[PDB]
Amino acid sequence: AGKKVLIVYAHQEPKSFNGSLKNVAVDELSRQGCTVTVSDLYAMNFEPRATDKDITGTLSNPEVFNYGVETHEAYKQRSLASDITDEQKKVREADLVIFQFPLYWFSVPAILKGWMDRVLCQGFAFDIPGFYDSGLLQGKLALLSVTTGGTAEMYTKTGVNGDSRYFLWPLQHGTLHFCGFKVLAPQISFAPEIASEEERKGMVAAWSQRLQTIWKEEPIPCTAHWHFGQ
Amino acid sequence: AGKKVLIVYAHQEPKSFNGSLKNVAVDELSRQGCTVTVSDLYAMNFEPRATDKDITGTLSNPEVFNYGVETHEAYKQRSLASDITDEQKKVREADLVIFQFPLYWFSVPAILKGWMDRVLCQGFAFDIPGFYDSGLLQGKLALLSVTTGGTAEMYTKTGVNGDSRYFLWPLQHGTLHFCGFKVLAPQISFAPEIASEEERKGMVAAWSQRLQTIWKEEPIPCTAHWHFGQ
Numbered sequence: 326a327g328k329k330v331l332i333v334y335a336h337q338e339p340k341s342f343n344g345s346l347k348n349v350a351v352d353e354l355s356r357q358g359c360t361v362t363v364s365d366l367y368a369m370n371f372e373p374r375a376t377d378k379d380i381t382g383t384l385s386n387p388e389v390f391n392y393g394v395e396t397h398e399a400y401k402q403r404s405l406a407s408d409i410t411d412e413q414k415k416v417r418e419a420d421l422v423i424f425q426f427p428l429y430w431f432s433v434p435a436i437l438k439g440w441m442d443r444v445l446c447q448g449f450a451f452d453i454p455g456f457y458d459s460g461l462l463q464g465k466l467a468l469l470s471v472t473t474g475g476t477a478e479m480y481t482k483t484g485v486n487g488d489s490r491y492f493l494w495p496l497q498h499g500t501l502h503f504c505g506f507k508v509l510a511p512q513i514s515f516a517p518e519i520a521s522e523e524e525r526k527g528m529v530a531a532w533s534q535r536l537q538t539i540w541k542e543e544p545i546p547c548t549a550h551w552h553f554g555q
Numbered sequence: 556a557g558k559k560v561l562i563v564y565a566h567q568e569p570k571s572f573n574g575s576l577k578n579v580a581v582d583e584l585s586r587q588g589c590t591v592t593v594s595d596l597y598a599m600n601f602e603p604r605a606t607d608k609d610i611t612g613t614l615s616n617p618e619v620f621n622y623g624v625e626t627h628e629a630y631k632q633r634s635l636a637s638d639i640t641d642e643q644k645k646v647r648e649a650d651l652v653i654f655q656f657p658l659y660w661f662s663v664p665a666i667l668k669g670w671m672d673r674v675l676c677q678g679f680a681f682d683i684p685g686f687y688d689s690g691l692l693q694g695k696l697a698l699l700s701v702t703t704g705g706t707a708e709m710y711t712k713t714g715v716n717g718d719s720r721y722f723l724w725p726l727q728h729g730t731l732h733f734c735g736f737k738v739l740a741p742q743i744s745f746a747p748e749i750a751s752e753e754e755r756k757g758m759v760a761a762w763s764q765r766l767q768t769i770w771k772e773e774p775i776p777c778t779a780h781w782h783f784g785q
């Protein structure tokens with residue numbers, strides 16, 4: 326019954342284009358009767374650094390610190406910092422996780438990279454057995470809503486930036502698919518700073534309109550072929 | 556005709572494999588007579604978040620905050636946070652910048668992503684126009700020294716992770732090349748955790764051995780063909 330959505334938002338300005346895309350998502354999904362939660366990373370002063378402060382109590386090896394081993398153990402022993410577990414609860418209950426962010430160096434802003442590094446720990450999002458198709462977050466949907474500085478023409482195979490699917494690889498495949506997420510087609514709003522009002526409105530409207538039927542969408546085939554193939 | 560090297564290092568543990576690769580680089584480059592500087596991000600508690608705290612002067616637009624616009628202006632006016640300018644000084648003087656880090660979600664750890672986001676600002680690393688082959692850091696060399704959890708086999712075209720070059724795209728092309736850097740071949744030390752003592756010592760020695768002749772190397776053609784073929 327019903328659907329739960331978590332929006333992980335990474336922009337410093339509420340009045341930004343990203344802020345508007347996040348607000349439109351909240352409005353539309355809320356109108357549909359969906360349960361909606363937003364993790365406004367900058368407003369939360371979310372910690373991006375992976376450090377030993379992410380484990381409470383005593384480390385499984387206070388001699389040599391291995392973040393991966395320590396957090397996996399901490400997860401299984403319920404000894405992770407509360408900011409991390411708070412995010413994990415949101416992800417665990419979510420049916421769909423939308424990431425809203427401006428492209429920073431062909432990737433996500435560092436504060437959001439930190440959310441991924443720290444929240445998607447072994448035991449919670451993946452394990453030796455459960456990864457990719459068997460990812461622990463299988464059954465969940467993920468969607469990247471990104472805005473860019475460069476134009477769509479620049480993001481083509483022969484363009485200066487290469488195809489946008491090229492930079493999506495680490496995020497959609499290396500991260501989301503690895504954790505079991507079914508990946509919905511990305512929403513890319515190209516160069517809003519350069520675009521005109523009519524175009525910007527069209528972009529936000531396209532996002533809102535798309536959200537009207539997001540639950541009918543089928544995941545993309547998150548494969549090397551989709552990202553690089555023909 | 557000496558050379559200056561900056562190693563941007565991102566690992567929490569001095570006794571780690573990454574720590575050993577960083578130390579081997581310092582040892583060998585120092586032995587060669589090179590000038591060496593290391594930015595130990597975790598030890599420095601380096602700030603990864605791109606926020607308005609990065610600008611100390613009067614904002615160009617105090618109503619709507621745009622990180623790119625404000626940092627570009629702040630760079631020109633010299634009102635950027637000192638931690639950013641401290642890093643820019645190191646980069647400006649360096650002939651070669653080596654990034655030493657463990658792969659985190661097919662990318663760099665968030666603390667290092669933050670270094671890229673905040674240090675490589677407009678006016679310093681690139682201009683518009685003034686990117687890719689016209690980037691402001693032209694004449695400089697960059698090299699990614701990465702360690703992984705996955706094995707070399709997993710990081711091949713037919714591997715579950717796809718070819719290792721795929722995840723290098725956002726970093727080598729979208730970031731380094733965009734800023735004008737000539738990119739030297741990446742050094743990828745695969746699955747040291749699974750490797751045996753002998754195999755690990757071998758990977759470290761291979762890195763040190765390569766550094767002996769690093770100044771005779773040619774950069775790679777940082778193109779889509781190099782990364783994806785086809």
Ligand SMILES: Cc1cc2nc3c(=O)[nH]c(=O)nc-3n(C[C@H](O)[C@H](O)[C@H](O)COP(=O)(O)OP(=O)(O)OC[C@H]3O[C@@H](n4cnc5c(N)ncnc54)[C@H](O)[C@@H]3O)c2cc1C
Pocket residue numbers: 336340341342343344345426427428429430431432472473474475476517518519522525526529605619621622623671672673729
């Ligand atoms: C460190 C850093 C690295 C970057 N790396 C890359 C990169 O690798 N590749 C790349 O392509 N780009 C890159 N960029 C560009 C960056 O992605 C863009 O600046 C950003 O995505 C633009 O959107 P943003 O600020 O929301 O837009 P705003 O600048 O917030 O949006 C543009 C305009 O939209 C208007 N607007 C807001 N709400 C609405 C609304 N509801 N309806 C209509 N208009 C509205 C605003 O007032 C504004 O004038 C980088 C930027 C930084 C700071």
Ligand SMILES: Cc1cc2nc3c(=O)[nH]c(=O)nc-3n(C[C@H](O)[C@H](O)[C@H](O)COP(=O)(O)OP(=O)(O)OC[C@H]3O[C@@H](n4cnc5c(N)ncnc54)[C@H](O)[C@@H]3O)c2cc1C
Pocket residue numbers: 375391392393441442443499566570571572573574575656657658659660661662702703704705706747748752755756759
């Ligand atoms: C949040 C997160 C995300 C990750 N994402 C990915 C991913 O997307 N893809 C992927 O492949 N991996 C991923 N990993 C795996 C991670 O990259 C590896 O754990 C790491 O790179 C291993 O190296 P590191 O800790 O130095 O190794 P250590 O664990 O530091 O090294 C392994 C062994 O090397 C030994 N050693 C150290 N120095 C020497 C020396 N001089 N001679 C001989 N032995 C030595 C150590 O004692 C240790 O037993 C991720 C990890 C985390 C925490």
Ligand SMILES: NC(=O)c1cc(N2CC2)c([N+](=O)[O-])cc1[N+](=O)[O-]
Pocket residue numbers: 429430474475476479486623733
């Ligand atoms: N419009 C573009 O060329 C552009 C602009 C910026 N800018 C203003 C912040 C960045 N970038 O910073 O990485 C990257 C690109 N990019 O396309 O590759």
Ligand SMILES: NC(=O)c1cc(N2CC2)c([N+](=O)[O-])cc1[N+](=O)[O-]
Pocket residue numbers: 393447499503660661703704705706709716
């Ligand atoms: N050894 C591996 O399979 C491995 C381990 C991890 N781990 C421990 C953090 C990650 N990863 O998290 O993305 C990825 C891989 N990878 O190969 O694709």
Ligand SMILES: [Zn+2]
Pocket residue numbers: 497498499502503546547548549
């Ligand atoms: Zn995939």
Ligand SMILES: [Zn+2]
Pocket residue numbers: 727728729732733776777778
């Ligand atoms: Zn390139």
Ligand SMILES: [Zn+2]
Pocket residue numbers: 727728776777778779781782
């Ligand atoms: Zn390239």
